[PDB]
Each structure stands twice: as C-alpha cells, then as structure tokens.
Design an enzyme around this catalytic site. Structure first.
Site, PDB file in Angstrom:
ATOM      1  CE1 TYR A 260       1.354  27.972  -4.032  1.00 48.93           C
ATOM      2  CE2 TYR A 260       2.555  28.756  -2.104  1.00 48.93           C
ATOM      3  CZ  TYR A 260       2.516  28.054  -3.298  1.00 48.93           C
ATOM      4  OH  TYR A 260       3.632  27.411  -3.769  1.00 48.93           O
TER       5      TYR A 260
ATOM      6  CG  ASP B  12      -5.781   1.452   7.646  1.00 51.40           C
ATOM      7  OD1 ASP B  12      -5.944   0.730   6.635  1.00 51.40           O
ATOM      8  OD2 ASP B  12      -5.095   2.501   7.620  1.00 51.40           O
TER       9      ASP B  12
ATOM     10  CG  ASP C 233      -1.436   1.407   6.339  1.00 47.59           C
ATOM     11  OD1 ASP C 233      -0.251   1.031   6.219  1.00 47.59           O
ATOM     12  OD2 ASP C 233      -1.808   2.574   6.100  1.00 47.59           O
TER      13      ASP C 233
ATOM     14  CD  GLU D  41      -2.841   1.096   2.449  1.00 46.84           C
ATOM     15  OE1 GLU D  41      -2.725   0.175   3.290  1.00 46.84           O
ATOM     16  OE2 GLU D  41      -3.606   2.067   2.616  1.00 46.84           O
TER      17      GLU D  41
HETATM   18 MG   LIG Z   1      -3.950   3.980   6.125  1.00 42.09          MG
END
Ligand SMILES: [Mg+2]
Ligand SMILES: [Mg+2]
Ligand SMILES: [Mg+2]
Ligand SMILES: [Mg+2]
Ligand SMILES: [Mg+2]
Ligand SMILES: [Mg+2]
Lengths: 677, 676
Positions: free
Chosen positions: A320, A108, A106, A26
């Site tokens: 900006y 998650d 990950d 990933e």
């Molecule tokens: Mg992640």
DNA sequence: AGCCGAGC
DNA sequence: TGCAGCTCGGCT
DNA sequence: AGCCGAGC
DNA sequence: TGCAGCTCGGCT
C-alpha cells in the site's frame, strides 16, 4: 499427538522407533517436497516436520526463553527426548520415538546455519547422542518439483550424509561457532579464512565430521553473513541495498511505484536471491526520514513508512506504500560515474557494481549499521553540509575539522565525553513550580516507548518504584514531541537536585568503538575515527574524479570526431562533391574509406575500452540535407568542440566542486520544502 | 463491566459504566480503517468512542444455521463488546441498562463493497433485535492520517443516522438478505437495470433503511453481477479481462512472477481491488489439471495446484511464474484489437468492454459465477468440436449437438436430457477380491474421494458396516489409480448393485442457469449452448466483416504511403527532385506542387473519427543506395498485392484461416503436453 | 533485557 | 512465510 | 452440509 | 489481509 504441522511416521513411538528417521525441513515448502518424495512406503519409517527458519541458539539462551520456545519443544515431544537424561547404554535409547534426525535444508549458506543450530542444539543437551550417530543430512543440488523429489528419495544412498563425532575437535568446533564466550576466537577464525581465500584467488581454487562441517561449510555462512551485513566504506551500502539503488537507477521512474512491485523488479533485474520480505524491509528503511533514521533518504516515503512514535514499526504494508528516487540521489551518485564502476555478473547477467562512488562519504551521512559473525558495525549520522565543508577543506590541502554526530531535525545536544563516546540529551525545562515541559527526546527514543516505559511508571508507580509525577498530557505532532508534566512542588525540587535530564531519562550514551567496514579492496577493516574514514574515502573519490576526466576527454573527443565526419559528409553532399544515389553498398563503403571518412569514432572508442562502420552517417534522415538542418548540424559540431575544450580546462577538483555546489543547492531546496510541507 | 479477551478492540473509557448509552462503538472495514479511526479520535475521543475492526464480509445471520452463528468469531465479538443478549427485547429504558454502548457507528469505504458490509450489519441487528433499530441504534461515518483528525473534528458533517419509518424498511432488508427472496431480487434488479437504461437515453442527515437498500445497496448488487457474471462474447469477467489485456500489452517473452504480474495489472488496467483477488484470478486462468481449463490462456510455470486437492495445493503467488500461452493470440487475434471499444478509467485507456475471439471461449473453459439474484454455470466443451461446428455453420449446414467435454478426462459424460448429464468415473473388476478405480468423475478431487468415500468404506461410518478390506494408492500428479480389496461376498453384492453406484463414481451435471451478458451488456438467460453458439456466431462473423473493411482501408493507406516513398526515391536518384540546402517551407511547398500526399496512414487513422511529409524525409540516406531502392520497390509491390488479395477474400475465408492456424498450434501444444 | 537489520 | 472467515445462487 | 470464485 | 519466532555483536 497435538502437533499440527507434523506428518508422524507410522512406526514412530512403537518397537521400530530406532529404525525411524525424523526429517526436519527448512520451512513448509520443503516439508511438502519431502512428503511428496517419500511416496507411500516412506510413511512407515520416515516422519516430516518443518522448521520456520533459524531456531534458538540454546547454548547460552535464558531458561525462560528455552522453556517457552515452541519449535524446540515441538522437536522434543516428536522425538521423545528428555532434558538432563543421558543416552549412553542401549537401555536409555528405548524412550525415543525416532532413532535418527535427518536435516533437509537448502544447499545455500543459510541452510548450513540451520544445520549448525540443530547440531548446536543436540550437542549442548545430549552430547552422548552425537557419539551414536544421531544426526544426518539430506543433500540436494542447485526448490524443485514433485517428480524430482521422488527421484532424490529413490536414490537415497547418494543424497544421505551422516555426521560423525571423532573427538574433542568436534566439541571445540561447535563451541567456536555458537558460544558467546568465543566472539574473539570467531574473529581470528574468520580472519584466517579471508586471508587464505585471497591467496588462492591469486593462484587457483559420504561421512562428515562436525569439525569439517564447521570449518569448511558453516564458515561460508559466517563469512557471507558479514558480506551482507557489514556495509562498504565507499558508498555506505550493503549488497542488498546496493541492488535496490541499481534497480531504481536503471528503471528511472518518474512516478510513484509500489514497494512490493519495486521489490519484485529488484529481484529480477539485480539477481536478488533471498525472500522478498527482507527486500521490502530494506526499501522501507532506505526511505524513512523521521528523526533518528536517515539524514538524507535516497528513496521518497510516499505513504506511511513509519513515524518517530514507534520508530518506524508503524509503517503500513509494502503493498500500500509507494516510493521513487529522491532528487538528491542522482546528485550524490552522478550517472556519468557509472562508466567507471566494476559491474558484477550473476547468471551471465550484468547486475549492480561492487560499489558506487558518491560525491561525499554516504557511510557517514545515514549511519551505517550491521551485525555479522565475529564483527558488527555501528556508525551514527553526520551532517551533510559539514561533510561537504570538510571535503572542500581537503581539496584545498587543509586538514578537516573534527566532526560530532549530527541528526537532522534533532533539537537536542550531542556532547563528546571521550574517544568515540557521546552524550545525547533531549530537552526539558521548568515552566512553573508544578510543571515541566519535554520538547525533545534523545535520538532513537521513540515517543510511544518513552510514554509507556518512563512517564506511565512515573505517574502510577510500579511494584519496585514510587510515583513521581501527578499528571501529564501529550501535544505531539507526527514529527515533534511535547509532553507537559505536572508535579508537586516538593517532587519537582528533588528532581532538579538530581538533574531533570537524569530523572526523566532524557540522556543516553552513544559509544562507537566498532566502526567496522569493507574498504575499497573488499577487505574488512576496523576504523578508529571518523576522520580515518573520511580520509580513505577522500583519496579514492579524488582519484575517480581523475578517471572521470580521462573518460570524458575520450568520449567527448570521439563525439567531436563523429560530428566532424557527419558535418563533412553533409557539406560535401549538398555541394555535389559526393553522391550516393543508386550506388551499391560495397562501392559506397569503399568510396567513403577512399575519401578519408572515419569508422564510427564513438563505437571505436567504446570498443577500445575493452569492417568500417559508416552507419552513423548514412542513418541520418533526408531532412539532414535541408537548409535549417545543415545550419543546426554545424552549430552542434562547433558546440561539441567547445565542450571538449571547456572540459579539458577543468581539473578533477573543479569537477568535484561543481558536483558539490549542485548538491548543496538542491539539498537546501528539498529541506526547505520539507519544512513547508 | 469490561472486555479483556479481544486483542483488536480499543474499548471506550466510559463503556460499561454509567455513561454507556452515550458511548459509540465504531465498527471499521479492516484494521487499516481502525488505525485511521483511532488516529482521528485525538485524545478526547477515547472516552466515548470505541473502535473494533471487521475483517471483511460478515455472516448473513438470517436463516444461517445455529452452529455457524454460535461459532462465528466476529458476531460473538460484537455481542460481547456491546453486551447484547439473544432473545432480549430493548423497548423501555430498563432493558437498555445492560448495554455497554448506546450506538454502533459503521465506518467503511464509500464503495459498493462497503455498502454491502453496512447492510450485513443492519441485517444482523434487524434479525435479532428489531427493537434497537426503533431507538436509533445504528449510524454511519461517511468519507469522500491528518485527514482523519480533520474528519473527526468535523464529526457531525460526516455522521448519518439510520431511521426506521415503517414496514417498508423491514421488507427492504428482507428483500436484500433473505434466502426466500431470490426471485424478488431478480425483479428488484431487472427494474433497476431497465430504469438505468431509460435515463441514459435522456440524462440531510437521516436515512431510512428502505432508501439505503433501494438506492445504495442495490448498487452493490448490480456491480456484484457485473463482476461475477461472464460476458457471452469472450467468456471473461472484467477482472479476468484486465489480466489478459495487461498480458497482451506487456507481451512477455519470459516467465513473470504472478505477484509481479498482479501489480502490473492493477497499474496498467486500473484494477481497484485487493491484490489477493487478482492473484486468485491469475492462478485460476493458468490451471490445467483435469476439471479446470480446456485451454489455459496463461501458462502454469510452477506449482499451480493439482487434481489431488482441486488446485487448493497451489504454491504462494510469490513463488510461481506465468506467461501467455502461444494459443492466446491465435484465439484473440491482435488485428481485431482495432475493432474493440476500449474503456476509460479517469483519463487512462484500459481493457475493452469485450474481446471477440475466433471461437466461443465462454464454452471452452466453463464460465462460472455467483452474483446477486442470478448465477452462471457452464461446463467445459471440446475446442475441436466447436471449431467443426463453426465451420459447418460457415457452410450453411446445421451445427451438431455438443456434449460437455473435459480435456484428459478418461470417464464418460452421457446426456440424460436437455442440460442434464451423468458424469461417471472408471472402475473395473480385476479379480474376485479386487476392483481398480482409474478415473473419478469431473471435479471430484482425489484426496476428497479418499477421505469421504474410501475411508468410510474401510472403517466404521456410523450405522453402515465396513465394506472393503483395504485399498492402495498409485496416483500420479495427473492420474488416479486406486486398488481396492474386498471379500468375494461383498464384492459380488457390490457387483450385483452398481459398482459406479456403490463406489460413488457417478455425479449428475445440471445446467439450467446459463446466465450471461450479451454483446450489448444486457443480462440474458440462455436455454441451450446452441443458442449461445448462434448468438456468438452472428457477432463474430459480423466482426470478420469489420476486420476486412478495416484492413482494406489500412493496407490501402500503407500502399499509398509506399507509393509516395518509392516515387520520391526514384525521382531523387534520377535528378528529377533535389532537396539539398532547400529550406523547410520551400521543400514542403515543392512537394505539394508535385502531387505528393500528406501522410496517408495518418490521414486514414484521423479519418476514422499543414501537409505531413515526415514519412518521406525521415527515411535514412541508405534509402538512396542500390540495394535499398530495389528493396523499397519490392515492398511497395507486395503491399499492393496484399491489398488486392484481401479484397477478393470473404470474411468467412479470413475466419477459416484463423481457425486452421489455431488448430495447427493446438495440435502441437497438446502433443508436447502429453510428452512432458 | 532488548534494540538495531538483513537474513531464515 | 503460511494461514484463515465470510457473500451470493444453483445444485447435490 | 458444502462446492464454485471474485470480492471484503 | 495482518500477524508472528529466531541469528549475529556491541552496547545500554
Ligand atoms: Mg534459502
Ligand atoms: Mg540508518
Ligand atoms: Mg474498498
Ligand atoms: Mg473454470
Ligand atoms: Mg447456502
Ligand atoms: Mg544476543
């Protein structure tokens, strides 16, 4: 052989191919961690290649999109796969350069989605490979350091989990998750999940089949996808947006703040656990105020936040552009109501509440919009002043008037065609028999897109359509539209016969049959009318005006008691009835108790909402004993007493009307100043 | 004639046709300036104005290699868009018929770096087509989205044309951009700095190239040195100094993301440049691998780079954290902030002209910088040896000579002569078929050594034959270990010659450009580090004198302050003074008549350029209680003792106290680093 | 076919 | 989210 | 042929 | 410093 980001295995492509594993990571940061963990010995039988986030859902994507997808094609060349080719026997498995794919994401929810997209990719094109054990995953805890990487890979057995095909239950689970023909099945799939999770919330609490992965791991992403994409009915926010407002309220900036700087402050103060680019996007979307975006922007767009020319896509970089709270923000979300909210905790740090409770249904003002899994939400904008008027009607026990969508500064018309269906029309009128003028485009038709997709093909013709106009000129500003179009007398007559708005694509349909929101209990609900949304919001907000009055009576009462004791101590001191000079702390405390002085009433009252403390008396300065400060203290005490009674005489409805009147006054001033500027 | 393979070009409608020479190509400083130019051009501007963005500084084509010129995307894009041809003269009007635009209009920021971009473009046209400058080919658009359309509506007020007036313009351009004119640039800038000092003891539409070079570009060259050549006093450049000034003011107790800190620096210190340069500086201040900083003042919390790639493998500044080292405030004591000259931007107070550390930090972390005319390069030096030399000079002894020293470097640094050193890695024979490399010379990175030395030895490398048979790597993130296999024959001949020589493990370090700004801001060239150490020593010793005078005055004021407060508390608990129900002005007049002093600390601070008794009457009522009276009496006596103890000490004593405190923490920090 | 927007 | 060119002087 | 680093 | 792919559901 031509893949820049690939760290090919040494034995990949040769005779040991089926013993080689391709690690798909990933992102590039995960790739370098894998390359770090493989040491030097790992290069012979392990290759590493990074995925740039979510990949194409190939199951029902078009053939053109599949052929032109660089990431899918890179994976095909690296592994050596071929479309349509079956991998049943062992003779067919020799054309592969790798024998196993190991997904490393990950740990998650979004990592689970990427795993599923890879599973969906292999299962759709080479289902025979899944029955051979082609896919596996590398588990991590919860990225980490280079030293931790080599420790994960040294213990490769404990982190390696292999996917298993066990029958048609695995095919149905993958299809359930990734087929467009299974949206309704996903609704039921998630409906059972959300219901079952409530039952256990009221009670308590190395091989993996694809069916168990879908129904026990991917479903956590699909549900989390809804929790972050479908807004709450109460405040009209999603959690990411709500974290932004919470951070802006806590900072209370009086001067401009760079969007990138604010995003970093939000991630720190509110425990935002995602990439900051999404957060900077949310901030820009919250600040936009061109026709078709927000009816009331809560953040000010100080800089180039986008225009109606490009639908906000012409915004400058978030490094900006500046922003800060609108003056209406705190009039819509009164600070006193914060004492009534349920604030969440992440890493034992207090963060944003489960929702704010604004004075009007903000979910209707700025048009809540979101795409999840199974469900999506789409609400148009509504007029703030009409919303206020309906709130005032309901406070008098009357029925609210029906409401049509309304967009600030939109010069066109919105007409009801049917239940939750509307016609949105721009403005076009005939000047002479060779000229029409277009002064408004329908909502969310951007000026440059209309120019390129409508007027240019009308001027030049295409391979499939004729030219209709002879010329056009533009006289736009940053916030208005003015096209002057030239035609022959004949062409103009035919356009009027067919309908000018129809011919010039100045009418679009708006259908709102997916008003899905989280109600105040956190339950996902589909609302059939905006009146239903307004009514459910009204009862909750009125009830919280009741809670606010109970809170103010207690807090103002404690403050009144506090001033009474402080004033009593000063008066008894300037008269000789009490002395503190050279007395010990123990004797001074036991004396104040013996004379009926109350421990800190405000601290006691706040602690009630969950030895004696006389610091509120003895931390007063010596100035407190002087003449003018005694008179000042007595007037403050008497003024607070009157403040308690003035508040007790107001009803929750009265307090709500005060907030509404104060909001409308500033809304008029801000919107009039906007037309000046 | 049209251009189709340049995505970012907005070609003029009439460019390439019969009206080509009436078309102007606007070259902008970046894409944001391009979008502002296309916005300002309205609709009429599309016919005779094209816009193309330059992504910052462009190639100095004068004396650049042929390969670099041919493969430069920006130069080639400009040539394709205008229609220019190398080696072609543009004298008559017959030659001008091959151009798609007749004029180039430069649009940059009205700052120094914008001037440098103008000059680099002027240098590009002047070097290849000097005949075009004599036709009036170059012009510029001056500035001070709606404002854009207002600038272009008033075009001719903002439009200035460059003018060629004679050989003085050729000489001026060559002076600025020729590698053969470095010494002339030194003289050019020396006169400018000298002339600018003289006027500080006291008080059109055409522009020639000579006036642009000598009156506008020279401002870039000077400010290029002011931001690139470090100060002798603290070893910082202004950007680095704004970072540490910001970290000191924030005083973070927990880690902060580098990107967040960069934004905090731009706001609190008035940093007027891109965030990317600032995040560069922060990463550079935090690095601690062999060959970077001997004492990193910011902590590298995350992947800040390793010696494997010379720090180029640092993670994105959005994912790495930093914080002050515990050594930073021991090196830059907060009390000395009261002695510095803090600068002002607009009306906001920002970083000082320099900090005054307790040791010459310019020697510890190796000051390095490239400006215009001059450059600076200093190696690293050992902190403890420098502390020892400061202690020797404080005792009237001569300082020992110092060789460069890099923290955790296992190799050798030998002095060949003044400012000349041989830096050697480590290689030793294991058996008669194996050598082992356990250290590379300073700033030789591991991956670079493998690719440029070991791989050519293993493989072909053109005429040279292969010399080694194999090699293996056993590196860590911070150490180097190569095991190399050879036959007995070629190992014997390699051993016969220099093993360090054959394996390229010796590099020379020459330091003949120790250029720094002295404490007055004057650029100065130092021949030895002893000269640097001595000049630093005299200034820092003098400022330890100022610290003592400042502390004696401030602590004395605080002593007087406590005396009055204690006097008031004792007189109050005894009945000698009462304040109850007395008016403010009567109480103020009463305190004056009894000899109570107006705020002594405020009076002392205002001395460094009605009565104020708030410091007495803002005390809490707790002050009258028994324990608080005893506490106030003890605090008063301790400050009195503190003043007297300080007046007896010499400035050298205060310096030695700071050095000992610094060395104690340096030992603790470096021992914890070796454990981790 | 492509927008909308919070994620990768 | 990761990635890429150049200046300027001294030195190899 | 290119590093070093504060700039664009 | 600017630039680029995808998901997911409803709808045009
Ligand atoms: Mg992640
Ligand atoms: Mg909206
Ligand atoms: Mg600039
Ligand atoms: Mg350095
Ligand atoms: Mg060079
Ligand atoms: Mg879709």
């Amino acid at each position: 052989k031509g893949i820049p980001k690939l760290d090919d295995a040494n034995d990949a492509g040769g005779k040991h191919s089926l013993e080689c594993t391709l690690i798909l990571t990933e992102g590039d940061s995960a790739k370098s961690l894998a390359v770090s963990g493989l040491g030097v010995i790992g290069r012979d039988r392990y290759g590493v290649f990074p995925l740039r986030g979510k990949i194409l859902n190939v199951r029902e994507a078009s053939h053109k999109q599949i052929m032109e997808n660089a990431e899918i094609n890179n994976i095909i060349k690296i592994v050596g796969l071929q479309y349509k080719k079956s991998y049943d026997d062992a003779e067919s498995l020799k054309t592969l350069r790798y024998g196993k794919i190991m997904i490393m994401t990950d740990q998650d929810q979004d990592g689970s989605h990427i795993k599923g997209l890879l599973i969906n990719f292999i299962h759709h094109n080479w289902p025979s490979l899944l029955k051979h054990g082609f896919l596996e995953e590398f588990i991590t805890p919860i990225t980490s350091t280079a030293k931790e990487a080599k420790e994960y890979f040294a213990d490769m057995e404990r982190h390696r989990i292999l996917f298993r095909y066990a029958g048609p239950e695995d095919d149905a689970a993958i299809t359930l998750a990734f087929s467009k023909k299974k949206i309704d099945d996903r609704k039921e799939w998630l409906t059972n999940f959300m219901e079952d999770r409530r039952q256990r919330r009221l009670h308590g609490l190395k091989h993996l089949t694809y069916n168990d992965f879908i129904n026990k791991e991917l479903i956590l992403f699909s549900n989390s996808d809804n929790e972050r994409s479908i807004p709450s009915l109460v405040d009209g926010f999603k959690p990411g947006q709500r974290k932004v407002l919470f951070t802006c309220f806590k900072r209370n900036d009086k001067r401009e703040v760079k969007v990138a700087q604010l995003a970093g402050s939000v991630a720190e103060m509110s425990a935002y656990h995602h990439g900051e680019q999404a957060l900077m996007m949310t901030i820009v979307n919250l600040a936009q105020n061109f026709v078709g975006s927000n009816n009331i922007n809560l953040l000010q767009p100080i800089g180039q936040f986008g225009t109606r020319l490009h639908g906000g896509k012409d915004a400058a970089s978030p490094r900006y552009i500046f922003t800060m709270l609108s003056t209406l923000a705190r009039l819509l979300f009164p600070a006193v109501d914060d004492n009534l909210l349920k604030f969440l905790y992440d890493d034992n740090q207090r963060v944003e509440p489960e929702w704010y409770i604004p004075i009007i249904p903000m979910v209707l003002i700025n048009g809540a919009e979101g795409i999840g899994t199974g469900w999506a939400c789409k609400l148009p904008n509504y007029d703030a002043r009409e919303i206020v008027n309906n709130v005032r009607r309901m406070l008098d026990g009357l029925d609210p008037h029906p409401m049509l969508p309304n967009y600030k500064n939109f010069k066109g018309t919105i007409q009801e065609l049917g239940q939750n269906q509307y016609a949105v029309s721009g403005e076009i009128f005939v000047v002479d028999r060779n000229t029409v003028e277009i002064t408004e485009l329908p909502v969310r038709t951007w000026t440059q897109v209309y120019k390129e997709q409508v007027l240019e093909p009308m001027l030049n013709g295409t391979d499939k359509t004729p030219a209709l106009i002879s010329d056009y000129k533009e006289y736009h500003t940053d916030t208005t539209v003015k096209f002057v179009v030239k035609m022959t007398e004949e062409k103009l007559a035919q356009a009027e016969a067919a309908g000018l708005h129809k011919v010039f694509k100045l009418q679009t349909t708006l259908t709102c049959n997916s008003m899905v929101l989280f109600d105040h209990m956190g339950c996902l609900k589909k609302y059939e009318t905006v009146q239903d949304i307004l009514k459910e919001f009204f009862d909750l907000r009125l009830s919280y005006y009741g809670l606010r009055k109970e809170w103010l009576v207690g807090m103002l009462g404690a403050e009144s008691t506090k001033l009474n004791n402080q004033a009593r101590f000063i008066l008894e001191k300037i008269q000789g009835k009490i002395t503190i000079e050279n007395r010990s702390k123990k004797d001074l405390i036991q004396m104040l108790v013996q004379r009926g002085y109350e421990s800190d009433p405000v601290k006691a009252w706040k602690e009630a909402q969950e030895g004696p403390d006389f610091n509120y008396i003895l931390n007063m300065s010596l100035w407190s004993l002087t003449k003018e400060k005694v008179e000042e203290l007595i007037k403050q005490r008497d003024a607070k007493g009157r403040e308690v009674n003035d508040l007790k005489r107001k009803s929750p409805s009265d307090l709500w009307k005060e907030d509404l009147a104060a909001f409308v006054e500033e809304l008029d001033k801000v919107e009039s100043q906007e037309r000046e500027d």
